[PDB]
């Protein structure tokens with residue numbers, strides 16, 4: 001399959017892309033806009049990019065908003081209470097159906113890489129079972145990673161350590177955690193030591209719900225980053241929801257950044273979720289409660305954006321569109337500068353792929369898998385400004401989605 | 412013309428709407444979904460609403476971002492400096508071209524009512540001249556209101572009072588202001604006394620850039636509300652950008668609400684703009700900087716959302732889509748409760764029409780103008796969750812915009 005007249009990110013030239021046997025066989029710069037060629041796909045000057053990534057979503061809880069009742073306070077903690085109620089009626093078939101629907105939404109919006117957290121503080125491990133199967137069933141659409149996420153705590157929930165271990169043995173690819181939610185500070189610390197030992201013993205990645213709270217003294221991030229640094233596993237470690245960093249003492253935070261850089265760990269921010277769940281315990285002025293995304297990125301630390309929730313006990317909205325999240329993130333994090341906008345797609349493509357350790361299985365380079373999108377925009381700035389539609393999604397060299405270009409009629 | 416199978420807001424039944432001679436002739440509930448009729452428009456269960464309203468935009472400055480240089484700090488004050496530079500090359504024809512392009516964007520997204528601020532601290536009054544003409548030229552698409560907006564101050568800019576007066580005499584429908592930007596507190600107060608006297612002398616509406624600053628002592632809102640209350644002109648007065656209220660002392664703000672309610676004035680919030688321009692003088696934690704929208708609404712005070720800028724010296728993004736702004740507002744203002752979501756379109760339709768004093772020239776009621784939209788969603792919640800496309804826009808009984816329903820193919 002051939003694509004002509006395609007823009008690539010942050011370049012002025014038009015390119016032809018040759019796809020063959022499921023891989024990118026050739027990328028060639030063109031002298032100028034070319035007339036059509038033997039039923040090649042004409043990008044018509046539109047941007048070709050690698051697929052969008054959703055590096056952090058909770059597929060087990062998706063589409064369960066209001067069951068059996070609503071999160072009235074809009075807080076993390078009531079969300080957990082409501083989820084606990086919902087868990088009493090989780091079945092594998094229920095989970096499968098909701099997960100597949102939400103995966104469909106993500107596919108519709110160009111996402112081909114997904115990392116889902118699954119609550120393993122559930123003695124049935126029903127959702128985990130369903131999602132491990134879904135990983136195989138939906139492989140034609142996405143590459144799914146699964147995180148063993150101990151929602152109610154490792155040290156603070158009955159048999160939490162056994163459940164984490166069992167989840168990993170069952171085949172979860174990533175070790176999760178929630179140290180800020182453990183019952184005492186010391187148990188928060190021991191939970192991080194445990195989960196890092198677990199990941200090392202079974203050779204898994206790590207992605208931890210780190211400090212998802214507005215408390216300036218929630219500092220489990222330092223424990224996680226130090227373990228990653230000492231163990232030499234930074235590239236394999238992600239800190240999600242470091243919301244407390246947005247409230248840290250500034251002298252401490254400056255000192256902390258030295259460790260963060262040295263550790264090599266990744267960061268995920270969920271700006272629509274955090275703007276909703278954070279700042280709930282302030283009056284006025286009301287803090288944003290989002291981590292220091294612009295500052296991490298300027299420091300050379302890999303950070304990216306994620307949806308987190310779609311219609312679940314924590315967040316009543318969501319539609320699968322990562323460009324909406326990008327927009328939110330750029331506004332809330334004060335990243336609407338000219339230079340920011342020219343490369344903003346980094347935060348929902350390249351940087352996210354790095355967090356998921358996709359390596360050579362991601363990116364528009366010869367020899368890599370033929371997974372790519374054609375976006376209805378010519379550069380990063382226009383993509384976010386217009387919320388550009390995904391016109392074509394190609395996966396393993398085949399078109400799996402085709403949208404018509406929007407046409408408006410006037411009198 | 413006839414529309415069948417239409418939902419109306421916050422109602423379960425389907426409705427047929429009969430439009431004749433530019434007005435709504437009849438609205439009738441149906442027993443159920445009906446098969447198509449004699450060239451009737453089939454809403455197919457989609458929502459019919461009165462048009463979106465853009466109650467606060469700066470059309471004189473639209474599409475000038477980066478000219479002659481960029482707002483690097485992303486602040487209100489640097490924006491004013493950049494605009495001051497751009498004013499040196501403003502012409503009526505330049506203004507007309509940019510304004511008409513942005514009006515086209517608003518039309519594409521179902522806006523039929525627009526209130527634009529125009530900077531009248533410009534001895535040429537060039538943009539105002541162009542926009543008064545545009546008001547007539549674009550009448551086929553929108554009903555435009557023009558605010559005489561003294562960007563560089565009434566008391567603090569050469570001949571500011573003369574310029575305000577001349578702008579009103581030229582035909583600006585609304586008197587503007589910027590008391591928080593006046594050089595001293597006493598001049599901020601005198602500016603409000605002057606602009607209210609001006610509005611009364613000429614019988615005009617009022618819409619003031621009130622306290623667009625994170626300073627908890629910026630309290631010109633109380634002066635404006637008191638003048639409106641005393642003069643009995645509450646309904647004709649709007650306070651835009653009361654960002655400082657998001658930082659007020661809470662005891663003061665409680666006392667203040669008593670006056671705000673009694674005064675009857677309207678409020679406009681610009682959440683995407685304020686999240687960008689506000690919080691810039693904090694470090695961490697970083698305030699949201701948006702007025703107390705949910706609290707105003709709960710108190711029975713009319714409040715609504717607006718875009719403010721499209722690609723201008725203050726804000727680099729913008730596409731005309733008020734639903735994007737609604738989404739932002741609901742998130743930043745903590746209004747994602749179930750009750751909130753079921754009526755959220757209030758903030759971009761009914762409430763905004765009230766701010767603009769549209770009266771019986773707005774709304775789906777028999778006898779009123781046949782101005783309405785068909786949205787690709789069945790209720791308020793779905794409209795914001797899906798960012799529903801405007802499928803049809805009808806103005807004065809005629810279709811002025813038609814979109815085809817998005818169709819995705821899966822090969």
Ligand SMILES: Cc1c[nH]c(=O)nc1N
Nearest residue numbers: 058209212273308309314
């Ligand atoms: C969605 C979600 C679930 N659970 C949690 O601890 N945090 C979240 N953001």
Ligand SMILES: Cc1c[nH]c(=O)nc1N
Nearest residue numbers: 469620623684719720725
């Ligand atoms: C856009 C804009 C222009 N001028 C101003 O004073 N405030 C604004 N938000």
Ligand SMILES: [Fe+2]
Nearest residue numbers: 056117209308
């Ligand atoms: Fe999460």
Ligand SMILES: [Fe+2]
Nearest residue numbers: 467528620719
């Ligand atoms: Fe404004």
